Design a protein around this nucleic acid. Structure first.
Ligand SMILES: [Mg+2]
Ligand SMILES: [Zn+2]
Ligand SMILES: [Zn+2]
Ligand SMILES: [Zn+2]
Lengths: 133, 49, 65, 196, 263, 559, 159, 114, 141, 168, 43, 85
RNA sequence: UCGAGAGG
DNA sequence: CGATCCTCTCGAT
């Protein structure tokens, strides 16, 4: 809006399976002992160790042609170090209430498991992912 | 650099090509096909040198 | 058939280096590698130009008219 | 062609500028596609290139003789000693932009042959002309400015397409076509047409 | 001292090694190509053969004649014949050369570029003189004659650029390397065991700091330093290749700026 | 045969063909000289009169001109000779045999013409240089290449004739083949290779390139897509920019091996609307696949839209690769040290396995199974033991090849290369065959006079333990030559036979066409089929589809 | 041989079965043998199937044979094409070859038949028996230089 | 034979003007300058320089076919900035930069021996 | 002196040949991994030795560099092409009046040679040039 | 299961899924009656051969048999709601889409099917290499393959090289 | 020229195949394609 | 006689590809022969583009005679035939 | 015309 | 009674 989802995760696994710039990262929520995340991250720009605890956010905020970010009177919705734009491609349910949302950031895939974000993440072509520290 | 081995016939250079033939005075045995009455044949290509 | 003027690849003038080359090999008794080196034929595109040349002109001049 | 069963026509001609270039300024005389190599399996072509590079550098003839003991490793050893990387690759920059290519190119000299039969000796275009005497059909050969044969195979292709009229045009308007007089009783070309 | 910065390493009568610091690759390259194909020079453009009894063909010699380097020091005070108001060539637009050689010797007499002779009035401008770099004084071999043999010809040297024909190049070879350490990660090295061992280091690695082991890849970094070596054929001196290079580009940029006045 | 079923024709042209990545699919690059020779008779109508006089005034030697002018009485005026050529004020109803110009319909062909796709209507594009030019993607239906092939060009002389070419023969409307019910054209060579290259997860492009790539697509909406990355430097993925060439409402789903809808290996395919979601684009996506991007776009958007797609994909890809570059060297056949050690012993233990079986045959202990000789059995064992060797040694090589390996890259894209190629070039060539059996005892009880009599050892009977990188021995060489020669003989033999088969086939079925009652009949009106192909459906309007009520468990069918 | 047969649970299974392969043909007698499945017996000799099982069975075998040759080499041709070829040989009641003996003996036009083989002699028998050519064939119209009834020409256009 | 004359690479014909301005149909403050008898020497140099302007939104060039010495340059600028102006400034900046280079080279050249 | 002998295919049948002289008759028991896998002696009852195994080839094939690192049909293909490749056919060309004569301006001797080329006088009358070539994906032309 | 059939149903569904922006959370507006009767009605407006007589009626009935099998199995009441999650508007569009797309898929009278067949077989036959086979692993797999075999078939060879009889 | 002067022609069991006995006598590689492949030999 | 009446017309209601290409051909050949156009030109000058517009606006006054194998025929006006191609 | 060599 | 298709060139009566 604003924000659709916000949580602090802790890195469990990091692997560069044939890739030299990208890494598929596996991290679970520090709070929610059920919440899971899968993410293809550009390590060449944002290096991630096998134990880091990072803050993840989904915004869909700050249609039309992209303009170069000219800071003349501009200020994006970020104090973050990693920003990605993507699209929803599947909304799966894994038993009872356990949700599973699928996002593609120009091929960089993302899967987020939990429950709570029911009337939140929609079939939107818009999806901004923000990761800090 | 020319090697010869050819002829000149009315200004045109002519090369005779080596002509492969089966050798004469050779005795050779051959099994003839299933319907044929003669099971085997022995042939001789007799010629004079 | 006569030394080419300039290297087909780069363009460095080579048609002024043949007699000099032939002399280094004969009179100085040294090898091609160090010969091409002395004429300043640094690059391999220039090196082939001289080293690969067959000077057929000399053979053609042997015919009378 | 190279000396390894590699036919090719000039697809285009680029000036020195637009061509990719070596850090020392070397530029290809010819560029061949990496897609030739896998299916054809002509390894010696790649080898003759490695040896001819090492050869032009050292100022010595390359021994590309068959049943010998010259290894790709041996050549590669001598070439590294001659400052270039052992396998024939070298950093190459884009001609248009000057930016280093992501890929390093397999550069070096390869003996190429100038083959017989060129374009200009083959081009032919006929839009009416000499007709063979008996058949009243276009003549044979480029030399006589003749017609290209629209054979049965080509006739069949038009039938498959269902182009009834085009097929009729090729066999009448182009090539043959003639007007004759038939007797309604005979059915033969007996009519002594005294026109005008 | 504004934008681009130059530092000359090798200074010779034939080669120029320097560093083109504080420059865009688009500029560094555009300069490299303009030196190759757009600096005008003087080269033979027409051959008239009256006598040819050599072993070499009329055109074969004519072709060779085109490639002989001729002084182009004062090529700007000579017109392109296409711009000249004459009929065919003249003195304002061309240089007429003569070649006459006969096999006077029982041995083999040679034809050099020294054997060419300027006929037209050059009007004090340094133009047309064949470029001789050989220590024996006879630069370039044109033809070889036996005894009966005789070659008598006249040739018109004209203004032009390599973009029209390679004979018109002050060019030769230009070396060009940026970022010897691949810090920019602009190329991805092909290897078997180790890139560092398999690929050899350039003499340019000394004029730059190493990658500094465990440090994050410089994302926003761009090429601003360029190592170049320009070698002249002789037609135009070395310094002039680069200055006329800088200038020709400036001229063709200005022409666009001028076309934005006419429309 | 030579004058009635086929004959030489007027309005013909022939030349060496060359490839053009800047020509369109339906286009043909015709050399100016040919255009200047071939004429179309155009009648003088108020619609054209002005352009026609201008052409008559350009004359036979300036290209967008004309030759002959025809008056009412049918008398021709030769424009290259006539004294009146200067003037000539055209009248309506007069014909102007003008030059062949841009965007005209031309029947383009390559011999042998054993396909309706060996004869397609092309859009004229008059160009410099002596060769006929064409798009690499039309290379396949014609089975042409650029080693020196020559192609034929015909010119329609009437309005109906040219209509028949544009509506029935055109290259876009020929994309999907009725023969194999799949497309007959697709993405090849540099483009197929470069697509995989660009399409990777690792592959990221910066603004300067992005805009240039975006502009290169002509049909472009003029909208810069939002980059996948908006952190230190905004980066675009190869997938993003390629998806620009793909239209909208184009949905494509695949699944290969892993393809966990989270595709970790980045395999399979998922295209939603006009964007690629996941998966590396290779031959299966962008080739002549039955369920490919081409079979989809032709069926969905249309032939002329799909034809546009060939151009778009090509332009983006070729450009990116022109700047990325791609090579192949001798270094790519070098298959490690420890891998070679394993390869060597793989053949060595196959050699022992043969010896033991030979020894057992020699001891009379071995017994062949019912139907075959003790010798017949022995041979096919050794034959297998030796194929196993080459294959195992080949797999050992393929495994050792890095992702950077340029041959591996070509095979991975499906551009060029097979396992066999990797295996023979870098590990072991293998066993040689003639008459479908290993090298024969041509000399009395021996293959060569360098061998002893009665020697059945792999090497002696045509086995080539060496790779093309290691090099072949004199014996190995000769044996490989023997096998190779067999290939070339039966290459020529096959072609001469299949040619006679084709005419026989064609002549027998000439007159079979679908009539105005779905009835498939001959020239006598005799019924062959009651519904064409047992359904009365067109071959090119069909595709393989899963029938869901046939498979699965009884339990699964229920739920 | 491997066989795809469904399990009692519904799903199809890879159940292996013993199959015998013969060097020689005597279909009639081998099918009457006890222990064999006479419903499943096969011979690559389609001409043998034709005389034992009937014309319709021969047609099926003839397709299996054309199919198998293409399939082996690693190619695919849509059913309808072989279907048509096979049906063309079948329609005559027996097996009509794709040579001068087979299709060229047919009741077709003298001009359309002389275009394949035995040219002059086809026209000779045509003259002798005084054959009437209906000119509905492609070939005759190609000889006659007329728009044949092939798609575009398969209907008359009027005002 | 069908070979064009090598002067057609840098020489304008008849009716052929150097620059051709056609406004873009797909975007607002956008235009397509078709530079005649020019290649990668001018194209890439102007395009990379246009990009340096903070007010330039889009700048890309393309040489549609190698047989011909043309190139299309597409510029998109901020509202209240003429794209024809962006092209002007770019050119001037290049001339300015090129000028500095000549002097700088000449000073170092005069400081040399051989 | 009977150090060499003329043998035909019929007499070939009764004799036992060795490929290499030294390599095929010294003694028996380190090895180069890059060097090709060679069998051994095995048969040691020789009557003759091969002068040079490369002699199995003839004139056209004697021009191919490393044909032992090439697929057999490619070697066949080249042998047809080499016979259509321009160059100095004869020194007396300027004196011969003949239909069609194609002659290379600057013929270059190959940088990669075959010991057989010397007898074929190839480096004396060459038929091709030493082109600097990049194997690459450039403009896609 | 997989067989070459006209109309890609899967494609139409995905097209309806995007066009009408189908929501997988909100329940559909369809009826059990709407699906069952609708799919039954679609199976009526399908044409290959028109007619009002039993001969041609059964002939056309037979031609659609397999396509209707695909249609029935794909457009089932459970799948239409559980899987696809189709709306009334999106459902009727699929129905009218198939009906029209099917008619387009039908072969055109005049189509030179014979010549097409001959060429369709001929082209790949010319591309066949190795007259022997690639089955040359075991000596018991020796049957006339490729071009020689194709010749035996077309000639109607009285005596074939490898006459075999496979028994079950 | 040399290659021509060393040619063999074979008029009309399997003459096209490279026979074992050809070792050192006829060239294993040099032979034309199609028409008369293997029948036209080179020494 | 022979024929088939308008009511009882059993043939395809849709225009075949072969029918379309033959119609577009004849009309293009008609237009090129200076024949009157039946639709307001939109800056058009090509006889095929005009004929294509004439078919699109259903004003081509040509008829198609569909022949059945018995010899019988069905006459269909271009105005009634469907263009779903 | 007949004959040879060649190109895909 | 057939045995690919199309194309090119030269030489001989
Ligand atoms: Mg080819
Ligand atoms: Zn050079
Ligand atoms: Zn009469
Ligand atoms: Zn003047």
């Amino acid at each position: 809006s604003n924000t659709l989802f916000d949580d602090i995760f802790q890195v469990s696994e990091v692997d560069p399976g044939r890739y030299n710039k990208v890494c598929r990262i596996e991290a679970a929520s520090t709070t929610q002992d059920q919440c899971k995340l899968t993410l293809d991250i550009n390590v060449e720009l944002f290096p991630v160790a096998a134990q880091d605890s990072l803050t993840v956010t989904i915004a869909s905020s700050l249609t039309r042609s992209w303009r170069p970010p000219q800071a003349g009177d501009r200020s994006l919705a970020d104090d973050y170090d990693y920003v990605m734009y993507g699209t929803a491609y599947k909304f799966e349910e894994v038993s009872k209430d356990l949700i599973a949302v699928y996002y593609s950031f120009g091929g960089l895939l993302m899967r987020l498991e939990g429950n709570y974000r029911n009337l939140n993440n929609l079939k939107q072509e818009n999806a901004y992912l923000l990761i800090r520290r | 650099f020319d090697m010869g081995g050819y002829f000149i016939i009315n200004g045109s250079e002519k090369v005779l090509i080596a002509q492969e033939r089966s050798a004469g005075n050779i005795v050779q045995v051959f099994k003839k096909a299933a319907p044929s009455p003669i099971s085997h044949v022995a042939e001789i290509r007799s010629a004079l040198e | 058939m006569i030394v080419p003027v300039r290297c087909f690849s780069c363009g460095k003038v080579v048609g002024d280096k043949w007699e000099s080359y032939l002399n280094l090999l004969q009179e100085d008794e040294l090898d091609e590698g160090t010969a091409l080196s002395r004429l300043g034929l640094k690059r391999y595109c220039c090196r082939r130009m001289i080293l690969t040349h067959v000077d057929l002109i000399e053979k053609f001049l042997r015919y009378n008219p | 062609a190279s000396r390894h069963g590699q036919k090719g026509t000039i697809g285009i001609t680029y000036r020195r500028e637009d061509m990719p270039f070596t850090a020392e300024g070397i530029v290809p005389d010819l560029i061949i596609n990496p897609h030739a190599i896998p299916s054809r399996m002509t390894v010696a072509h790649l080898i003759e290139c490695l040896l001819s590079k090492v050869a032009a550098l050292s100022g010595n003839e390359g021994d590309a003789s068959p049943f010998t003991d010259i290894t790709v490793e041996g050549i590669s050893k001598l070439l590294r000693e001659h400052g270039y990387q052992s396998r024939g690759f070298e950093v190459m920059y884009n001609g248009h932009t000057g930016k280093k290519l992501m890929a390093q190119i397999f550069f070096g000299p390869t003996y190429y042959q100038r083959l017989r039969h060129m374009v200009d000796d083959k081009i032919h275009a006929r839009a009416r002309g000499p007709m063979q005497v008996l058949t009243r059909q276009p003549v044979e050969g480029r030399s006589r400015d003749g017609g290209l044969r629209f054979g049965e195979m080509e006739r069949d292709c038009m039938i498959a397409h269902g182009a009834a009229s085009f097929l009729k045009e090729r066999l009448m308007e182009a090539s043959d076509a003639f007007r004759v007089h038939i007797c309604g009783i005979c059915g033969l070309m007996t009519v002594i047409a005294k026109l005008n | 001292e504004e934008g681009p910065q130059v530092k000359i390493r090798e200074a010779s009568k034939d080669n120029v090694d320097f560093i083109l610091s504080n420059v865009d690759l688009a500029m560094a390259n555009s300069l490299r190509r303009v030196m190759i194909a757009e600096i005008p020079t003087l080269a033979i453009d027409s051959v008239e053969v009256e006598t040819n009894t050599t072993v070499l063909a009329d055109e074969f010699i004519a072709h060779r004649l085109g490639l002989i380097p001729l002084q182009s020091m004062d090529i700007e005070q000579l017109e392109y014949s296409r711009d000249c108001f004459c009929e065919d060539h003249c003195d304002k637009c061309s240089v007429v050369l003569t070649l006459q050689a006969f096999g006077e010797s029982e041995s083999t007499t040679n034809v050099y570029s020294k054997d060419l002779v300027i006929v037209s009035n050059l009007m004090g401008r340094n133009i047309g003189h064949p470029i001789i770099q050989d220590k024996e004084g006879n630069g370039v071999l044109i033809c070889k004659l036996r005894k009966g043999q005789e070659l008598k010809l006249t040739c018109v040297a004209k203004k032009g650029i390599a973009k029209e024909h390679a004979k018109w190049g002050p060019a030769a070879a230009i070396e060009f390397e940026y970022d010897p350490w691949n810090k920019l990660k602009h190329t991805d090295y092909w290897y078997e065991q180790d890139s560092a061992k398999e690929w050899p280091q350039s003499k340019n690695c000394e004029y730059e700091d190493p990658p500094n082991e465990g440090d994050p890849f410089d994302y926003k970094a761009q090429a601003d330093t360029f190592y170049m070596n320009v070698e002249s054929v002789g037609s135009i001196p070395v310094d002039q290749v680069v200055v006329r290079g800088i200038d020709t580009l400036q001229k063709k940029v200005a022409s666009i700026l001028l076309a934005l006045t006419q429309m | 045969r030579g004058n009635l079923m086929g004959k030489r024709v007027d309005f013909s042209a022939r030349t060496v063909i060359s490839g053009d990545p800047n020509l369109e699919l339906d286009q043909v690059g015709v050399p100016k000289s040919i255009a200047k020779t071939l004429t179309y008779p155009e009648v003088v109508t108020p619609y054209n009169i002005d352009r026609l006089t201008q052409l008559v005034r350009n004359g036979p030697n300036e290209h967008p001109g004309a030759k002959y002018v025809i008056r009412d009485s049918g008398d021709r005026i030769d424009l290259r000779y006539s004294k009146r050529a200067g003037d000539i004020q055209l009248q309506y109803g007069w014909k102007v045999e003008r030059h062949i110009m841009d965007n005209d319909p031309v029947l383009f062909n390559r011999q042998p013409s054993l396909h309706k796709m060996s004869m397609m209507a092309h859009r004229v594009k008059v160009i410099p240089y002596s060769t006929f030019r064409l798009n690499l993607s039309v290379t396949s239906p014609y089975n042409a290449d650029f080693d020196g092939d020559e192609m034929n060009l015909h010119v329609p002389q009437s309005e109906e004739t040219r209509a028949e070419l544009s509506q029935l023969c055109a290259v876009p409307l020929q994309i999907v083949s009725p023969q194999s019910n799949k497309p007959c054209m697709g993405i090849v060579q540099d483009t197929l290779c470069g697509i995989r290259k660009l399409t990777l997860r690792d592959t990221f492009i910066e603004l300067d390139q992005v805009l240039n790539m975006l502009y290169w697509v002509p049909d472009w909406d003029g909208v810069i897509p939002t980059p996948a990355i908006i952190k230190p430097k905004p980066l675009w993925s190869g997938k993003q920019i390629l998806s620009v060439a793909i239209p909208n409402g184009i949905h494509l789903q695949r699944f290969d091996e892993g393809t966990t809808l989270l595709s970790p290996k980045d395999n399979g395919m998922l295209i939603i609307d006009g964007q690629i979601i996941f998966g590396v684009v290779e031959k299966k996506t962008v080739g002549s696949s039955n369920g490919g991007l081409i079979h989809v776009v032709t069926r969905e958007k249309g032939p002329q839209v799909c034809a546009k797609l060939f151009g778009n994909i090509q332009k983006v890809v070729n450009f990116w690769l022109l700047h990325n570059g791609f090579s192949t060297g001798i270094g790519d056949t070098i298959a490690d040290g420890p891998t070679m050690r394993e390869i060597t012993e793989t053949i060595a233990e196959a050699k022992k396995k043969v010896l033991d079986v030979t020894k057992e045959a020699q001891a009379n202990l071995l017994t062949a199974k019912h139907g075959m000789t003790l010798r017949e059995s022995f041979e096919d064992n050794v034959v297998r033991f030796l194929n196993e060797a080459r294959d195992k040694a080949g797999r050992l090589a393929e495994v050792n090849l890095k992702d950077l390996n340029n041959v591996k890259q070509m095979v991975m894209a499906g551009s060029k290369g097979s396992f066999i190629n990797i295996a023979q070039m870098s590990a072991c060539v293998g066993q040689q065959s003639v008459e479908g059996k290993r090298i024969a005892f041509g000399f009395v009880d021996r293959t060569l006079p360098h061998f002893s009599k009665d020697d059945y050892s792999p090497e002696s009977k045509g086995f080539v333990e060496n790779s093309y990188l290691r090099g072949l021995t004199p014996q190995e060489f000769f044996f490989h030559a023997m096998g190779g020669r067999e290939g070339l003989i039966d290459t020529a033999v096959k072609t001469a036979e299949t040619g006679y088969i084709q005419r026989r086939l064609v002549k027998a079925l000439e007159d079979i066409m679908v009539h105005y009652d779905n009835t498939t009949r001959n020239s006598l009106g005799n019924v062959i089929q009651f519904i064409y192909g047992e359904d009365g459906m067109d071959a090119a309007h069909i595709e393989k589809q899963s029938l869901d009520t046939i498979g699965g468990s009884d339990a699964a069918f229920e739920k | 041989y491997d066989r795809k047969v469904p399990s009692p649970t519904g799903e199809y299974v890879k159940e292996p079965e013993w199959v015998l392969e013969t060097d020689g043909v005597n279909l009639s007698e081998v099918m009457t043998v006890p222990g064999i499945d006479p419903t499943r017996i096969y011979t690559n000799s389609f001409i043998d199937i034709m005389e034992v099982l009937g014309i319709e069975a021969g047609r099926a075998a003839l397709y299996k044979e054309v199919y198998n040759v293409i399939a082996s080499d690693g190619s695919y041709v849509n059913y309808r094409h072989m279907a048509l070829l096979v049906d063309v040989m079948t329609t005559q009641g027996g097996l009509t070859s794709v040579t001068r003996h087979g299709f060229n003996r047919s009741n077709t036009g003298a001009l359309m038949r002389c275009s394949f083989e035995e040219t002059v002699e086809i026209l000779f028998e045509a003259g002798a028996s005084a054959e009437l050519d209906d000119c509905r064939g492609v070939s005759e119209n190609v000889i006659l230089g007329q728009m044949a009834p092939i798609g575009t020409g398969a209907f008359d256009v009027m005002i | 034979m069908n070979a064009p004359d090598r002067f057609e690479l840098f020489l304008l014909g008849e009716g052929e003007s150097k620059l051709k301005i056609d406004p873009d149909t797909k975007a607002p403050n956008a235009v397509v300058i078709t530079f005649e008898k020019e290649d990668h020497t001018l194209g890439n140099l102007i395009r990379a320089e246009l990009l340096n302007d903070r007010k330039v939104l889009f700048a890309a060039y393309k040489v549609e076919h190698p047989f011909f010495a043309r190139f299309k340059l597409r510029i998109q600028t901020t509202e209240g900035y003429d794209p024809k102006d962006a092209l002007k400034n770019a050119c001037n900046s290049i001339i300015n930069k090129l000028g500095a280079l000549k002097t700088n080279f000449e000073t170092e050249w005069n400081l040399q021996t051989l | 002196e009977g150090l060499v002998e003329y043998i035909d295919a019929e007499e070939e049948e009764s004799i036992l040949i060795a490929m290499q002289p030294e390599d095929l008759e010294p003694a028996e028991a380190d090895v180069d991994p890059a060097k090709r896998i060679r069998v051994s002696h095995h048969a040691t009852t020789f009557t003759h030795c091969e002068i040079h195994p490369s002699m199995i080839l003839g004139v056209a094939a004697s021009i191919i560099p490393f044909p032992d690192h090439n697929q057999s049909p490619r070697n066949t293909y080249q042998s047809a092409m080499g016979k259509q490749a321009m160059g100095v056919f004869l020194t007396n060309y300027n004196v011969r009046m003949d239909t069609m004569a194609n002659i290379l301006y600057y013929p270059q001797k190959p940088l990669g040679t075959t010991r057989a080329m010397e007898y074929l006088k190839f480096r004396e009358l060459p038929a091709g040039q030493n082109a600097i070539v990049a194997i690459a994906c450039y403009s896609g032309y | 299961a997989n067989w070459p059939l006209p109309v890609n149903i899967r494609r139409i569904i995905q097209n309806a899924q995007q066009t009408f922006h189908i929501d997988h959370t909100k329940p559909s507006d369809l009826t059990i009656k709407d699906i069952v009767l609708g799919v039954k009605d679609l199976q009526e407006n399908l044409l290959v051969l028109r007619g009002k007589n039993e001969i041609i009626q059964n002939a056309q009935r037979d031609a659609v048999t397999l396509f209707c099998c695909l249609l029935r199995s794909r457009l089932a009441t459970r799948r239409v709601l559980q899987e696809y999650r189709l709306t009334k508007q999106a459902f009727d569009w699929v129905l009218s889409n198939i009906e029209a797309q099917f008619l387009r898929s039908v072969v055109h009278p005049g189509e030179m099917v014979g010549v097409l067949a001959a060429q369709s077989i001929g082209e790949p036959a010319t591309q066949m290499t190795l007259n022997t086979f690639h089955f040359a692993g075991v000596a018991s797999k020796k049957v006339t393959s490729g071009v020689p075999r194709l010749k035996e078939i077309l000639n109607v060879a009285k005596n074939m090289k490898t006459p075999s009889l496979t028994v079950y | 020229t040399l290659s021509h002067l060393r040619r063999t022609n074979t008029p009309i069991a399997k003459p096209r195949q490279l026979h074992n006995t050809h070792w050192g006598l006829v060239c294993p590689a040099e032979t034309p394609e199609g028409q008369a492949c293997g029948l036209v030999k080179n020494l | 006689e022979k024929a088939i009446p308008k009511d009882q017309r059993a043939t395809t209601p849709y225009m075949t590809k072969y029918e379309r290409a033959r119609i577009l051909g004849t009309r293009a050949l008609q237009i090129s022969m200076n024949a009157p156009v039946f639709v307001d030109l939109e800056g058009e000058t090509d006889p095929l583009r005009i004929a294509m517009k004439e078919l699109a606006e259903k004003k081509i006054p040509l008829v198609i005679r569909r022949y059945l194998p018995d010899g019988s025929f069905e006459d269909w006006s271009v105005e009634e035939l469907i263009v779903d191609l």
